[PDB]
Scaffold this active site. Structure first.
Site, short mmCIF file in Angstrom:
data_model
loop_
_atom_site.label_atom_id
_atom_site.label_comp_id
_atom_site.label_asym_id
_atom_site.label_seq_id
_atom_site.Cartn_x
_atom_site.Cartn_y
_atom_site.Cartn_z
N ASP A 181 -1.11 0.61 -13.81
CA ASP A 181 -1.41 1.14 -12.48
C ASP A 181 -2.44 0.27 -11.74
OD1 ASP A 181 0.33 3.44 -12.55
OD2 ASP A 181 -1.31 4.88 -12.42
N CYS A 215 9.22 -4.29 -5.67
CA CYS A 215 8.17 -3.43 -6.21
C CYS A 215 7.87 -2.38 -5.15
CB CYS A 215 6.98 -4.29 -6.66
SG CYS A 215 6.38 -5.56 -5.41
N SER A 216 6.62 -2.05 -4.83
CA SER A 216 6.44 -1.11 -3.72
C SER A 216 6.51 -1.83 -2.36
CB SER A 216 5.13 -0.32 -3.88
OG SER A 216 5.10 0.74 -2.92
N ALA A 217 5.70 -2.87 -2.14
CA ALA A 217 5.78 -3.62 -0.87
C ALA A 217 6.73 -4.80 -0.92
CB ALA A 217 4.39 -4.14 -0.46
N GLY A 218 7.11 -5.24 -2.11
CA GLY A 218 7.97 -6.40 -2.25
C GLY A 218 7.31 -7.76 -2.07
N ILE A 219 6.02 -7.89 -2.36
CA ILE A 219 5.31 -9.17 -2.22
C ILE A 219 4.43 -9.52 -3.41
CG2 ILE A 219 5.42 -9.10 0.28
CD1 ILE A 219 2.51 -8.21 0.37
N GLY A 220 3.89 -8.53 -4.12
CA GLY A 220 2.94 -8.82 -5.19
C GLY A 220 3.56 -9.08 -6.55
N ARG A 221 3.87 -8.02 -7.31
CA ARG A 221 4.63 -8.19 -8.55
C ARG A 221 5.94 -8.96 -8.31
NH1 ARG A 221 3.96 -1.89 -10.57
NH2 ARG A 221 1.69 -1.79 -10.13
N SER A 222 6.64 -8.67 -7.20
CA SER A 222 7.90 -9.35 -6.89
C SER A 222 7.69 -10.86 -6.73
CB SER A 222 8.51 -8.78 -5.60
OG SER A 222 9.00 -7.44 -5.73
N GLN A 262 -0.62 -10.99 -4.24
CA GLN A 262 -1.50 -10.15 -3.42
C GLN A 262 -2.97 -10.24 -3.80
OE1 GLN A 262 0.93 -6.41 -4.01
NE2 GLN A 262 0.31 -6.03 -1.89
#
Ligand SMILES: N#Cc1ccc(N2CCCC2)cn1
EC number: 3.1.3.48
Length: 292
Positions: A181, A215-222, A262
């Site tokens: 998390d 992912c949630s925003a599509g920029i960090g983990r992605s 991010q």
């Protein structure tokens, strides 16, 4: 500089935040006018994360062709990816329309539906074989075929049917279920094992449309997923693998979608993943690691 020793030099000097801020300063700025039209407000999860106009995926619809999704095309590596936000209640039909129209084989999900006690994306696939989903706005049917639950990730086989033509296709859902998390994983080992499972399925290969990753925003983990994949491929293709510059690859990817990676912790984790991954791929690797 090489990667592994540039890495230790940033650790010893404690300058990850400064390196990351340099990337933020040099990153491309292109218009995202379609994303900001008033009619698209409920199609965006976050007001500060938008696809650029020049690289956005268009839905094959004349009313409204907008989805928060970007085509990342890596020319030297010969890989393409679609990076998108986690679907919203009013965009789950658009999401599967995109998968269909772009001829994707695989969907890569790097978040849980609920994290930190809040919803991070809609429940957009069926959880039981006998309870299929129908998306009436885009005329698609989606059925769960099988599910394999492992300790760090789950793989699902799904059937997508275009109800207009009665054509069907098999889609693979690769769900990384153990990203914490807060922060990043302590070791990249399970993330790399997951990347290799996506690769082995064919979902990243040129005989299919681009993989869809979110992912949630599509920029960090992605961003971490596609950055690690592309850097490892370049290290295999080039005569001199130490010439691969992860900061330059990241800036190239940021020409196609804003904000990839991010935090400075995500940047450090990406270095770690590429460094460890390059040892398993090999000349110094066993013939048997592909089974590890
Ligand atoms: N080709 C190939 C290849 C290389 C590495 C690999 N892994 C190492 C860790 C487990 C899986 C799998 N396939």
């Amino acid at each position: 500089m090489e990667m592994e020793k540039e890495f230790e030099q940033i650790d010893k000097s404690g300058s990850w935040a400064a390196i990351y801020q340099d990337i933020r300063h040099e990153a491309s700025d292109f218009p995202s006018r379609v994303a900001k039209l008033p009619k698209n407000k409920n199609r965006n999860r976050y007001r500060d994360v938008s696809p650029f106009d020049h690289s956005r995926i268009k839905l094959h619809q004349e009313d409204n062709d907008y989805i928060n999704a970007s085509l990342i095309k890596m020319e030297e590596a010969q890989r393409s990816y679609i990076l998108t936000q986690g679907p919203l209640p009013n965009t789950v039909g658009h999401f599967w329309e995109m998968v269909w129209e772009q001829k994707s084989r695989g969907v890569v999900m790097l978040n849980r539906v609920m994290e930190k006690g809040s919803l991070k994306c809609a429940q957009y696939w069926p959880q039981k074989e006998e309870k299929e989903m129908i998306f009436e706005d885009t005329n698609l049917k989606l059925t769960l075929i099988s599910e394999d639950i492992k300790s760090y990730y789950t793989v699902r086989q799904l059937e997508l049917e275009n109800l207009t033509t009665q054509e069907t296709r098999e889609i693979l859902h690769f769900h990384y279920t153990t990203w914490p998390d807060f922060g990043v994983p302590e070791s990249p080992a399970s993330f790399l094992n997951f990347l290799f499972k996506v690769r082995e399925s064919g979902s990243l290969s040129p005989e299919h449309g681009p993989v869809v990753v979110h992912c949630s925003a599509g920029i960090g983990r992605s961003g971490t997923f596609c950055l690690a994949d592309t850097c490892l491929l370049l290290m295999d293709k080039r005569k001199d693998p130490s010439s691969v510059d992860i900061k330059k690859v990241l800036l190239e990817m940021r020409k196609f979608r804003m904000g990839l990676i991010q935090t400075a912790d995500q940047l450090r984790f990406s270095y770690l993943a590429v460094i460890e991954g390059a040892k398993f791929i090999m000349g110094d690797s066993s013939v048997q690691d592909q089974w590890k």
